[PDB]
Design a protein around this ligand. Structure first.
Ligand SMILES: [Mg+2]
Ligand SMILES: [Mg+2]
Ligand SMILES: [Mg+2]
Ligand SMILES: [Mg+2]
Ligand SMILES: [Mg+2]
Ligand SMILES: [Mg+2]
Ligand SMILES: [Mg+2]
Ligand SMILES: [Mg+2]
Ligand SMILES: [Mg+2]
Ligand SMILES: [Mg+2]
Ligand SMILES: [Mg+2]
Ligand SMILES: [Mg+2]
Ligand SMILES: [Mg+2]
Ligand SMILES: [Mg+2]
Ligand SMILES: [Mg+2]
Ligand SMILES: [Mg+2]
Ligand SMILES: [Mg+2]
Ligand SMILES: [Mg+2]
Ligand SMILES: [Mg+2]
Ligand SMILES: [Mg+2]
Ligand SMILES: [Mg+2]
Ligand SMILES: [Mg+2]
Lengths: 129, 88, 218
RNA sequence: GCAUUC
RNA sequence: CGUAAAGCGCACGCAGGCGGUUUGUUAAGUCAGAUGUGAAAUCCCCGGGCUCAACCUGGGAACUGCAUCUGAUACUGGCAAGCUUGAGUCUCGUAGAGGGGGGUAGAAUUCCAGGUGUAGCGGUGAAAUGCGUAGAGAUCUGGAGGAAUACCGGUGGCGAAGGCGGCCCCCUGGACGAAGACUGACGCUCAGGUGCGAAAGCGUGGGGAGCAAACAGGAUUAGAUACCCUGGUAGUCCACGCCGUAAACGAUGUCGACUUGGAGGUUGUGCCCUUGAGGCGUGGCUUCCGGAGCUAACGCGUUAAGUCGACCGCCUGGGGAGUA
């Protein structure tokens, strides 16, 4: 059964990037929008949109630079089978700062750089390259 | 499996009305009716393993539904088992 | 311009999925090309060829199918460019210095034929060696005076001449190709979707490119 | 048809 | 963990692990700060002293931990109310060697009785054993009995797997389609456990035509405890129970999502419909070839061995040994 809406979300971007799809659509959720919201901030996805009220659907407009996928790599870190919690000083850095790790802090979902600046830890959701 | 006339009677008896076929009691009642009916079938068809597999599926399904009904509200679960005379 | 012809593609079962953007519809079980999309791309390639011609570059025409063997030669005669109208020998460009000796042989063989020193009583000299002329003329005749690698490749079928496309990519030479529904993109820098076998279509293509080079050459 | 071994 | 060691034969399932979506609430997990504690030495960092060094020594950091208090609420969990997409129920249909019980038919083999009929038949590479003048084989008529269902028949269908082919009836499981209604997370996986599980084999009682381990004879051969031939018992069949193993194989665990295509088969369905052994869509199952990608390679390739997630099983050089 579907037990990782987040992992399925990330898989669609990875599969969509490989297939050179302009955009991908999937069921929407507040958590998914939170991840989608941060990703758009740094320019990994050109935009995201939600359609429907009883059956909301999240569509992400993927982008490409020089004909190759912008998202070089994206992997789930915290999983229901094994979840990861990092402290303020234990926040990881992806590709020595070039990448960003999405962290679910008490103040909301934000990048590791933002969490480090704010000085809060939380769940490490995924690494984006 | 079960005749339409018998199926309608169970639905109208355990459900809120004649078109409420999704009620847990209706589902349990329908499964219980078929399980009781099949008792005679396997009494003489002792070696009929393939259809017996389907029977255990109904047995497991009924137990799963009963557990859900007990969890959601014990009051109705107690009434349902008394009327069906099961869980002995 | 967007005139008749060209739009007729191959059968649906022979299509190549990679060109889904460049197809318009499966009319009568045969895909038909998006002409309005073709024109901006065709003009772009024509403009690029003019720019290459402007810098005294060399563009070589590659057509192997019998439906285009004669047409390409006419284009190479309307302008002063090179062509290959028969089988494209493997390694025409990767090891051009190897076939360079074959070109030299034509110069000697041509010299004997023209100067008359081959007119000797022996039929080995008169026929056995002279027959090698059209063997190499029909094979290397259109590439005799290149003097090196080209500066751009014009191909009438990106799949039938896939060997030519692969060599051009290895050497980095720009590639212009008429790509039909069943052909393979991503090997051609500038893809010209359209029919490759219709006589009225092939003549328009090579006829069109042969005009830009002359004006670009000035 | 049968027909081993170094 | 397809073929190198490694996916239980296949299922159902408790404990356990994990779980769609919305709101409120709790603040257990989690996170932030503070306090107490975390002996000294040692390690660690900046200094000091023995001629330098080892060594000794000052201060700091560190001791990643634990407990309490104060706060944060994104995520997980608890609690409450929801929602319909997961899952399930109902209505109407469709296909099928799905399973259990009973009956019945036709062709053929063998045997038994009788007629016609005469010297061979049968078998092999060749031959013999064998059968036959006590009348065989061949041919015709009647009868008995057992087993399997030609053609249809098809990388066709069904089933969890093993597996399942004449026809008819009785009982019965699952799957799929069309719209419509209903329940409202009731789900996924599964150690132990439980059930099913080819063939051979075992127990009791039947049946026994054909076939056939063992066995016998005749050949072959240097020998032939074999291959070939003529015979032939257990077994193969039925009822009940046991056995629980197969190269039980797709050598590929189960469930869910995602990712270019092409040509067929099979089984539903919508639609245009006069220009039918038509035209365009939409589901389930299934065969073949191939793209990206993956792989040590071979190859796999929307039915993944691609990209991910949940859970379980299993492997750690060969032999000894799946043996004591
Ligand atoms: Mg010896
Ligand atoms: Mg092996
Ligand atoms: Mg093995
Ligand atoms: Mg297996
Ligand atoms: Mg949840
Ligand atoms: Mg707390
Ligand atoms: Mg200390
Ligand atoms: Mg000192
Ligand atoms: Mg010290
Ligand atoms: Mg909650
Ligand atoms: Mg077990
Ligand atoms: Mg047996
Ligand atoms: Mg027996
Ligand atoms: Mg017996
Ligand atoms: Mg024998
Ligand atoms: Mg085994
Ligand atoms: Mg088998
Ligand atoms: Mg098989
Ligand atoms: Mg195995
Ligand atoms: Mg299971
Ligand atoms: Mg393949
Ligand atoms: Mg043993």
């Amino acid at each position: 059964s579907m037990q990782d809406p987040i992992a399925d979300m990330l898989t669609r971007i990875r599969n969509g990037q490989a297939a050179n799809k302009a955009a991908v659509t999937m069921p929407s959720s507040k958590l998914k929008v939170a991840i989608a919201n941060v990703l758009k901030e740094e320019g990994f996805i050109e935009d995201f949109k939600v359609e429907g009220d009883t059956k909301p659907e999240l569509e992400l407009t993927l982008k490409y630079f020089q004909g190759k996928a912008v998202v070089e790599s994206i992997q789930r870190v915290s999983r229901p089978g094994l979840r990861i919690y990092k402290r303020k000083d234990e926040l990881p850095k992806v590709m020595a700062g070039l990448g960003i790790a999405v962290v679910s802090t008490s103040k909301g979902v934000m990048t590791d750089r933002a969490a480090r600046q704010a000085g809060l830890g939380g769940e490490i959701i995924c690494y984006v390259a | 499996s079960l005749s339409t006339e018998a199926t309608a009677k169970i639905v109208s008896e355990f459900g809120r009305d004649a078109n409420d076929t999704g009620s847990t009691e209706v589902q349990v009642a329908l499964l219980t009716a078929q399980i009781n009916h099949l008792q005679g079938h396997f009494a003489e068809h002792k070696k009929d393993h393939h259809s017996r597999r389907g029977l255990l599926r109904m047995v497991s399904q009924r137990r799963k539904l009963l557990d859900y009904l007990k969890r959601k509200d014990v009051a109705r679960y107690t009434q349902l088992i008394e009327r069906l005379g099961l869980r002995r | 311009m967007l005139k008749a012809g060209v739009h007729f593609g191959h059968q649906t079962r022979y299509w190549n999925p990679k060109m889904k953007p460049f197809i318009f519809g499966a009319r009568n079980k045969v895909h038909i090309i998006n002409l309005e999309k073709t024109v901006p791309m065709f003009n772009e390639a024509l403009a690029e060829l003019n720019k290459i011609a402007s810098r005294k570059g060399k563009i070589l025409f590659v057509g192997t199918k019998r439906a285009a063997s004669e047409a390409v030669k006419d284009a190479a005669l309307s302008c002063d460019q090179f062509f290959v109208n028969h089988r494209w020998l493997g390694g025409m460009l990767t090891n051009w210095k190897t076939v360079r000796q074959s070109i030299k042989r034509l110069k000697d063989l041509e010299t004997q034929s023209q100067d008359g020193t081959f007119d000797k009583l022996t039929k080995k000299e008169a026929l056995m060696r002279t027959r090698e002329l059209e063997k190499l003329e029909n094979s290397l005749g259109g590439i005799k005076d290149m003097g090196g690698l080209p500066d751009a490749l014009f191909v009438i079928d990106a799949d039938h001449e896939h060997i030519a496309i692969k060599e051009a990519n290895n050497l980095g030479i720009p590639v212009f190709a008429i790509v039909d529904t069943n052909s393979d993109p991503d090997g051609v820098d500038f893809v010209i979707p359209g029919n490759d076998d219709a006589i009225r279509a092939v003549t328009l293509y090579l006829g069109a490119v042969a005009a830009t080079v002359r004006e670009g050459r000035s």
